[PDB]
Amino acid sequence: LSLTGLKRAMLSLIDGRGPTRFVLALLAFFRFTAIAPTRAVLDRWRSVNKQTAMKHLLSFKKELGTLTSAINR
Amino acid sequence: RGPTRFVLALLAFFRFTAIAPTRAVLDRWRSVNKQTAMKHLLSFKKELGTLTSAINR
Amino acid sequence: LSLTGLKRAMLSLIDGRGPTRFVLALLAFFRFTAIAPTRAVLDRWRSVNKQTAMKHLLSFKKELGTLTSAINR
Amino acid sequence: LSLTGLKRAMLSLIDGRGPTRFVLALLAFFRFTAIAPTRAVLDRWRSVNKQTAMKHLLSFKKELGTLTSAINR
Ligand SMILES: [Ca+2]
Numbered sequence: 001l002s003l004t005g006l007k008r009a010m011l012s013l014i015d016g017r018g019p020t021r022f023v024l025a026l027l028a029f030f031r032f033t034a035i036a037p038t039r040a041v042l043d044r045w046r047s048v049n050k051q052t053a054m055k056h057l058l059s060f061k062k063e064l065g066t067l068t069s070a071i072n073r
Numbered sequence: 074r075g076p077t078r079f080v081l082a083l084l085a086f087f088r089f090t091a092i093a094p095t096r097a098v099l100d101r102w103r104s105v106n107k108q109t110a111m112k113h114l115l116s117f118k119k120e121l122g123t124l125t126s127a128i129n130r
Numbered sequence: 131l132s133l134t135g136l137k138r139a140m141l142s143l144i145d146g147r148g149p150t151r152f153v154l155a156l157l158a159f160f161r162f163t164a165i166a167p168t169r170a171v172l173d174r175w176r177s178v179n180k181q182t183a184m185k186h187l188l189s190f191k192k193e194l195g196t197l198t199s200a201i202n203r
Numbered sequence: 204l205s206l207t208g209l210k211r212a213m214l215s216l217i218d219g220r221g222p223t224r225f226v227l228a229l230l231a232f233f234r235f236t237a238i239a240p241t242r243a244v245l246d247r248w249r250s251v252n253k254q255t256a257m258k259h260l261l262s263f264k265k266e267l268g269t270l271t272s273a274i275n276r
């Protein structure tokens with residue numbers, strides 16, 4: 001459920017903890033929307049493993065792509 | 074309901090996280106003005122870019 | 131073969147005609163490497179169909195993605 | 204002929220060596236265009252310094268961005 005997934009987001013922005021990619025997804029969204037991210041989320045963005053952090057951001061880029069080429073029709 | 078960019082940002086997030094988006098969010102993704110929808114997605118791509126190059130150091 | 135593709139490229143390079151995405155690929159290349167494109171290539175980049183031109187550049191972006199996530203291991 | 208930025212782009216494929224960025228740019232182009240890259244080009248792709256290789260690929264991504272953004276007007 002997306003309810004399971006909402007709640008996750010909500011704890012994830014309260015504490016910076018929880019799934020690496022979720023916190024990164026949150027960060028991307030906090031940037032997409034002109035919103036200042038929570039200290040707990042920002043704190044994590046400075047700690048995440050460079051290699052893993054890139055893995056995830058890159059697939060976000062990919063996801064955006066499928067959304068873009070979708071709207072090209 | 075609410076800001077075009079916000080709903081799209083939500084959509085992006087729902088795809089980044091492997092979460093199935095709510096019908097009300099999906100419903101709007103089919104209605105968005107092609108032109109404006111593009112403008113936004115493209116700026117998302119740009120923001121991801123800033124984050125990537127940041128982690129390259 | 132690729133020599134077929136090479137001669138194809140070289141042709142597209144002097145006279146900017148030939149396949150839309152090839153000329154756009156060339157253009158990406160001429161930007162990737164800091165080289166100033168031929169008048170014939172540049173002249174086409176102002177004429178390309180907005181929608182088609184977009185389709186292609188987006189696919190390039192995709193291609194680069196597979197290359198980058200490749201280097202992440 | 205009167206193309207300084209060809210005669211080395213010549214070398215590159217029939218001769219695996221030369222600037223790291225150039226070789227990766229060629230690789231990008233060989234992927235954008237549905238062309239199978241030369242052994243000598245592919246050989247280098249396996250040897251490039253991961254860190255430098257990513258620096259370059261990410262700047263390509265950026266270049267494609269300016270080109271996309273451009274076509275959106
Ligand atoms: Ca984890």
Ligand SMILES: [Ca+2]
Nearest residue numbers: 148149150151
């Ligand atoms: Ca064509």
Ligand SMILES: [Cl-]
Nearest residue numbers: 012017018019
């Ligand atoms: Cl969590």
Ligand SMILES: [Cl-]
Nearest residue numbers: 138141148149
């Ligand atoms: Cl041809």
